[PDB]
Design a protein around this nucleic acid. Sequence first.
RNA 1: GUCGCGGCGCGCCGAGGGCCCGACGCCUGGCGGAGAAUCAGGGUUCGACUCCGGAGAGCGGGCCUGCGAGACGGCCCGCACAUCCAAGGACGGCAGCAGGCGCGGAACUUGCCCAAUGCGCGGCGCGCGAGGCAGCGACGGGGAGCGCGCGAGCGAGGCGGGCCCACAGCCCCCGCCGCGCAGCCGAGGGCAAGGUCUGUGCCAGCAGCCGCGGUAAUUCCAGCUCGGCGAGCGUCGCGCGGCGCUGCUGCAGUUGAAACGCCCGUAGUUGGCCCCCCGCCGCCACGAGGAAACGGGAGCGCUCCAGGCAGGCCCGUUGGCCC
Lengths: 140, 129, 176, 120, 67
Amino acid sequence: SGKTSGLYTARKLRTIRRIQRWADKRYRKAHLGTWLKANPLEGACMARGIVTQKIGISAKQPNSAVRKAVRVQLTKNSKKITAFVPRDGSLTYIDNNDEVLVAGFGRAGRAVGDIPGCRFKVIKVAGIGLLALFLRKREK
Amino acid sequence: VRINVLRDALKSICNAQRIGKKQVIVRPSSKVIIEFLQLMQKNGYISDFAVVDNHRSNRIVVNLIGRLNKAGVISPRFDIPANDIEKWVVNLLPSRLFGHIILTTSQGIMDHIEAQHRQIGGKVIGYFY
Amino acid sequence: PRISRHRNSSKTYSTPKKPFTKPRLDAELKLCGEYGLKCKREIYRARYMLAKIRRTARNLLTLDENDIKRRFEGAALLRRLHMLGILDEEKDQLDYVLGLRIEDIFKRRLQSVIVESKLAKSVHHARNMIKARHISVGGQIVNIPSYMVRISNTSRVAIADTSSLAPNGKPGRTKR
Amino acid sequence: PEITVKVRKVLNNPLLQRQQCVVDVLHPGCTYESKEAIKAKVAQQLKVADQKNIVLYGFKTSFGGGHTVGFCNAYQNMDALMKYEPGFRKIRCGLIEAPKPVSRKQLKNLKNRRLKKRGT
Amino acid sequence: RAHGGLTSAGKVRKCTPKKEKKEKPRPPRGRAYKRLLYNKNFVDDTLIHNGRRLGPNNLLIRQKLGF
RNA sequence: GUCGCGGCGCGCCGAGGGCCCGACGCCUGGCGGAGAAUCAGGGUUCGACUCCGGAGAGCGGGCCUGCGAGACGGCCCGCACAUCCAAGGACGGCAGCAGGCGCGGAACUUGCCCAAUGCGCGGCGCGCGAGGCAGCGACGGGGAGCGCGCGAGCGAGGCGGGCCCACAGCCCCCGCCGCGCAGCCGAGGGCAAGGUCUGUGCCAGCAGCCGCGGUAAUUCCAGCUCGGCGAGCGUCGCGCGGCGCUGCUGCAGUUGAAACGCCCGUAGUUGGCCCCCCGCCGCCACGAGGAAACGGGAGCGCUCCAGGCAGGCCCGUUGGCCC
């Protein structure tokens, strides 16, 4: 690195920092401003909505089983995004259009683990938590 | 080109001492490099020195006690208040036992120890380990 | 301006930087049994109080003696620590805080004094006796276990008249 | 088993025809005796006479033993006793009586209902 | 091909044998649970330390403890 | 012309202005600051909510009253959208408090209310959905319990008292009595804790991550057990640290990501020794005068803090001091 160092050089360093700040994938993710418009979720923990067609996405490798997910149109942005169902055999409860909240996969954008092409994860159906429906803690 | 005479002198003195050659030459004598050298001699790191004098830049021949561990410069001078003298001791001095940072104050040019004790802080010319 | 909402909140409970470390984990249970702490939030509550008491001293040590900010604060540091008794009054040193013991804050806790003075003779017995309002400091009955008493007034710890000291005449269910 | 009264200090007031004081009681584990037994004890200790003129208001028992914090107002002048002390404790003291009013929103309702005209 | 999928509905999850908790009262929680832990995992001679520390969920502690 | 200087306007002239140190333009899910978050330093991030200034009351204009407003629970018009409306008319404005509709992930009583705390009219008191008070409320905090022990002990409560309080409540204080009572995450590694025992066939599913299930699962599905934390545990989106992975301190560029193909060149940045004394620069020491809250931080035992600035025979007792 050459580096420009002088008592009167707060210009080179100020422009350089501003321009070279947006080089990181993470920095650009939060500083371009594209991510709030681009994400299906408008930068929120959960989004309400109505359920649409259910989906059976093939897994990759090692995982080798279809993981049932439901594609739901979020009411606020009128856009359809798929949400991975919670625990074992929890999709049978979800059928026709019903109130569904969807949440992040931790990664915040990347698809979780080795199940390919799924960015979001369903957390609720109707008015009862879908992880309680699985345990029959709270179910219709 | 040559902007910092002290860096070319510091690495002149440090490099020579690394080979163990007590007598060393410096391409230009500066009244400020006189300050660092005589504060080095005063602290006892360097031994008797001299400047063979032409009418031009002048060349400095310095004999050494051979004990110098490290010397160096902060380019260009950055001014610190007498309140912040100790943060600069942490970054550029190994220990607070053999700490010496060359400061410049209007009332005489001294090493860091004496200056903060005198409650005056100026610019750090060069590091002295 | 919603005047009654105006207030302040505190964070005595501070969790550590790496949770599942075997040495920290084992010491927790070991300390929990030693001073009879019902919850593990308290040991961290102690850690937060200990740190503040550690930093003040480190900054004070780096100041030269008799520097006014150093002198007044140093005497202050000693005054509060000597009241606690974790710092022996004899030590009287601003630098003496360094090398401090968490066990000493635990020792200061009044629940500890009851076990040591054989008032209840056990930490488990001590918490139960304080729960049943059976130990009073200077006669001021306290049912909260961690009264925490300054050593300067440790000699004034006392028992309670309801059913432990000279029975008032209320033996729990036994009375009826 | 006593209502011993500390009466810790008094403050003289000539301007307001009262002599506000800090009172306190000593209850050695005894139930603090209401306000009436304290009231009799306070007046005798006050040495101003007339149990009604002295007023003990808002007593707080300290947890356990009784050392109630609070105030004693020696309103020897009766008119001041009937006016300066807070009205709410004055009615409970028996200086005056309290009837039944409205929400005061109804008072506002009256002001609003007749506000529109020029004399109705 | 018919490997499986959405038609499969937690076949193993519903096929687990129906089970119930072994009858048991409540060891009191709090410092009493902490004291039970202080004994179960600390001191108490060989109960947690047969030779070297056996381990809390260890098979060797089990059976000697009872189950 | 205005309270007033002014291009502010209105005439009259002369050609000026401002710019790569980025002018002008464009955009902003742009109120700024005191502050807030997380961190050794160095930072980074957010500032709408206490307070402080600025604005604005559906939207644009104009105007009155006044000493001051372009006031909006002043007016009058344009524009939307209303409401009554007997067909002839009128009359709104909740980004004040509740409360609905709408909306979303989500966000408190169509309560009581001037006694206080300040402000209005007013020495012989009244109002103020300001506020005060209660309600609601796992936003969040700060502090207990489910026993201890071999006996007897309490605290969540029931009833009455006291206390309290515009009024009630609450902690508290008293008695008969006392009805002790837990979760939600994991257990192959990071990361702490069973190769126990059951279903199991790369099926379901698990799975932050790295990885497991292909017929004998430490990885799922359950009951065992057990680790952690705890009346709070987890799941998400977020900011900071991690991350010297944004680098000024403090990063790389011969092959990981990276020296313009080459040279001149204007701004820009950088210029060796060198004139002791003067004068300006910059520059430190260092004051004056710089609102708090908040935070650093005297003293102080609410049943202990979190709290607060109180308290008692008292520094003119406080509330010092650094912001």
